[PDB]
Amino acid sequence: PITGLVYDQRMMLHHNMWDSHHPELPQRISRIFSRHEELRLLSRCHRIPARLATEEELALCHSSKHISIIKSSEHMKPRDLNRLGDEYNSIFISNESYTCALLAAGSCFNSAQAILTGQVRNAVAIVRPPGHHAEKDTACGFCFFNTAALTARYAQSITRESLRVLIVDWDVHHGNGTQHIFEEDDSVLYISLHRYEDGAFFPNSEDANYDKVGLGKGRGYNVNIPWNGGKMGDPEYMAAFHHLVMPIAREFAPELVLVSAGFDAARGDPLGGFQVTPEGYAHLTHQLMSLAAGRVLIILEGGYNLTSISESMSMCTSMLLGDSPPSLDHLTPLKTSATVSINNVLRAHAPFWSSLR
Ligand SMILES: [K+]
Ligand SMILES: [K+]
Ligand SMILES: [Zn+2]
């Protein structure tokens, strides 16, 4: 039972040359890595090397146009970088951005490979820029390429095309990119918990609502758990995992679990407004470890309180290493809004999933 870990300082090169205090900071991965040292968790892990993703691998989820455009930004002057970045929804670009996105995906490919070949049982991927907002043909929300989505395809490419991989997205934002890429796919189960606020919360789309359950043969394999009007926390997420995520995931019976692990739902996050605790993320992690024979890859997405995400993700690694879950705070009754959300998803997925009725 050994846990993998991948981190590369080079992914800090991605930076905003106008707003040096833009929340998607280079130090995000630095602080998480550092926190692993202080808790002596790093030594307990097998260090998995990072690498560049190939354009061939990028093409698993992304158009030729999108790849070439981002590839070109590498040799651009700042005025053009400003220009190009402005064409997207919430995107800043530097000359090192393309390489960093490649390193994020490549790092997660090696981690998945290590898990699927049995070298490690599970792994954590401390990477940036994030990925779940990135679409097939466009960049969005600090994301250039959809790392978790690409990792699912790579995983299938080195085993079999029908390898059942589950993607659990507990980043506070909806992974619009990930949902769309697999919306017609029954081999990749996408489960997302996110702040919705009737579509007022980023990325401001109604695709994130519970009624969007997938298309074609992918009907029922897209699960949206939206939160409305309320500071959701550990009780609401534990309830959603108990009633929805885990029973659906068990029925799906994944062979690989990918976690789009953003920590912007964490308490203290400048953007999230939620209050999930580090203890909360640990229990979520531990819960997911009971699936796919423990084959779990935890991939960093969002999260912008340097202290919050450092503590939160370290707690997840501690769980993968086999340590015992810390006790949760005394569990408040669910916020009335949560029960509404949970029941709607229940109703919307009860036909496709036997364990829900
Ligand atoms: K999410
Ligand atoms: K799907
Ligand atoms: Zn986010």
Cβ count near 52 (within 10 Å): 16
DSSP one-letter code for 334: P
For CA atoms 144, 150, 152, 153, give the dihedral sign: positive
Give, to the nearest 10 degrees, the angle between helix 278-288 and helix 306-320: 30
Ligand nearest to the CA of 224: 1
Q: CA-based Rg of the chain, rounded to a whole angstrom?
A: 19
Asked if 241 and 208 touch (Cβ cutoff 8 Å), the reply is no
Ligand nearest to the CA of 195: 1
For the CA atoms of 214, 220, 225, 228, what is the dihedral angle to 10 degrees? 60
Give the residue carrying structure tokens 């691998």: 57
Q: How far is the CA of 34 from the centre of ligand 3 (A)?
A: 22
Q: Is 330 a catalytic residue?
A: no
Q: Which residues contact 254 (CB under 8 A, 6 or more apart)?
A: 164, 165, 166, 189, 291, 292
Q: Which residues surround ligand 3, an ion (CB under 5 A)?
A: 171, 173, 262, 264, 302
Q: Which CATH superfamily is domain 1-357 in?
A: Histone deacetylase domain (3.40.800.20)
Q: How far is the CA of 263 from the centre of ligand 3 (A)?
A: 7
Helices (H), 117-229: 147-157, 176-181
Six-digit token string for 33: 């890595």
Asked if 108 and 145 touch (Cβ cutoff 8 Å), the reply is no
Ligand nearest to the CA of 178: 2
Binding residues for Zn(2+): 171, 173, 264
Q: What are phi and psi of 193, to 5 degrees?
A: -105, 130
C-alpha 354: how far from chain center: 26
Q: How far is the CA of 354 from the centre of ligand 2 (A)?
A: 17
Asked if 92 and 70 touch (Cβ cutoff 8 Å), the reply is no
Q: How far is the CA of 75 from the centre of ligand 1 (A)?
A: 33
Q: What are phi and psi of 269, to 5 degrees?
A: -65, 135
Between strands 188-195 and 165-169, the pairing is: parallel
Q: How far is the CA of 220 from the centre of ligand 2 (A)?
A: 8
Q: How far is the CA of 64 from the centre of ligand 3 (A)?
A: 26
Six-digit token string for 251: 């029925």
Cβ count near 47 (within 10 Å): 11
Ligand nearest to the CA of 169: 1
Q: How far is the CA of 33 from the centre of ligand 1 (A)?
A: 23
Strand partners, 193: 225
Say how far apart CA 28 and CA 301 lie, in whole Å.
Answer: 10
Q: What are phi and psi of 260, to 5 degrees?
A: -75, 80
C-alpha 47: how far from chain center: 21
Instruction: Say if residue 315 is exposed, middle or buried (CB neighbours under 10 Å; 0-12, 13-18, 19+).
Output: buried
Helix (H, G, I), strand (E, B) or coil at 308: helix
Q: What are phi and psi of 42, to 5 degrees?
A: -60, -45
Six-digit token string for 159: 């085993």
Six-digit token string for 348: 């919307």
Binding residues: 171, 173, 264
Ligand nearest to the CA of 223: 2
Resolution in A: 2.2
Going by C-alpha positions, the residue among 18, 244, 4, 291 that lies closest to residue 123 is 4
Q: Which residues contact 192 (CB under 8 A, 6 or more apart)?
A: 168, 169, 170, 174, 175, 178, 179, 208, 223, 224, 225, 260
Give the residue carrying structure tokens 């990072």: 50
For CA atoms 308, 177, 287, 116, give the dihedral sign: negative
Question: Which of 66, 133, 174, 194 is the catalytic position?
Answer: 133
Helix (H, G, I), strand (E, B) or coil at 160: coil
Query: Using a CB cutoff of 8 Å and minimum separation of 24, what contacts does 221-224 make?
Result: 221/182, 221/185, 221/186, 221/188, 221/189, 221/190, 221/252, 221/352, 222/179, 222/182, 222/183, 222/190, 223/189, 223/190, 223/191, 223/192, 223/248, 223/345, 223/349, 224/174, 224/179, 224/192, 224/194, 224/345
Q: How far is the CA of 76 from the centre of ligand 1 (A)?
A: 33
Helix H or strand E segment including 306? helix 306-320
CA angle 146–152–156, rounded 5-degree value: 145
Going by C-alpha positions, the residue among 146, 67, 44 that lies closest to residue 105 is 146
Asked if 133 and 15 touch (Cβ cutoff 8 Å), the reply is no
Say how far apart CA 261 and CA 167 lie, in whole Å.
Answer: 10
Beta strands in 34-126 (DSSP E): 45-47, 122-125
Strand partners, 168: 191, 259
Answer whether the bond into residue 129 is a cis peptide, omega within 30°: yes
Q: How far is the CA of 193 from the centre of ligand 1 (A)?
A: 4
Give the residue carrying structure tokens 């964490």: 266
Between strands 296-300 and 222-227, the pairing is: unpaired
Helix H or strand E segment including 103? helix 97-116
Helix (H, G, I), strand (E, B) or coil at 258: strand
Q: Which residues contact 316 (CB under 8 A, 6 or more apart)?
A: 124, 261, 281, 282, 284, 285, 298
Six-digit token string for 46: 């097998």
